[PDB]
Amino acid sequence: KLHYKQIVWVKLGNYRWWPAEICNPRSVPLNIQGLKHDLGDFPVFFFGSHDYYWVHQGRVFPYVEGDKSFAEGQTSINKTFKKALEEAAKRFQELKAQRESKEALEIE
């Protein structure tokens, strides 16, 4: 039952959700009003980043006190990302070291 001033979750992609507040389009700044958007979008204000964007109604769901479903989902993905960076940097060097080692063996 979406409405202006409501706190909501916005799907930014399949692996990214973000809390925001739905804006009345009559209330946002002129330069936000004039941003091209798809017919039937409404504006939200994203917390943390503090910027406005027009969004599809299909990508916006109510923020419900207590239900940390979206929040915990996001933080635990975001945490794993750190591990992912170190693993990839590690794998990248091993693979590079192998490539370099074979290359060295091909040069007299």
What's the rounded Cα separation, in Å, for the pair 102 and 105?
5
Question: Rule CB under 8 A: is residue 20 a binding residue for a copy of itself?
Answer: yes
Select from 9-17, 23-31, 35-43, 100-108 the region that touches a copy of itself (CB under 8 A). Answer: 9-17
Contacts of 17 (CB under 8 A, 6+ apart): 9, 10, 11, 70, 73, 74
Tell me the number of residues near a copy of itself by CB under 8 A: 33
Q: Nearer Cβ to a copy of itself, position 5 or 26?
A: 5
Tokens of 97: 């070291």
In this chain, which of 7, 28, 37, 41 binds a copy of itself, going by CB under 8 A? 7
In this chain, which of 2, 16, 67, 73 binds a copy of itself, going by CB under 8 A? 16
Select from 23-31, 32-40, 46-54, 100-108 the region that touches a copy of itself (CB under 8 A). Answer: 46-54
In this chain, which of 18, 25, 32, 41 binds a copy of itself, going by CB under 8 A? 18
Tokens of 29: 């700044």
Q: How far is the CB of 27 from a copy of itself (least distance, A)?
A: 15
Contacts of 79 (CB under 8 A, 6+ apart): none
The dihedrals phi and psi of 9, each to the nearest 5 degrees, come to -100, 135
Count other Cβ atoms within 10 Å, centred on residue 68: 11
Question: Rule CB under 8 A: is residue 82 a binding residue for a copy of itself?
Answer: yes
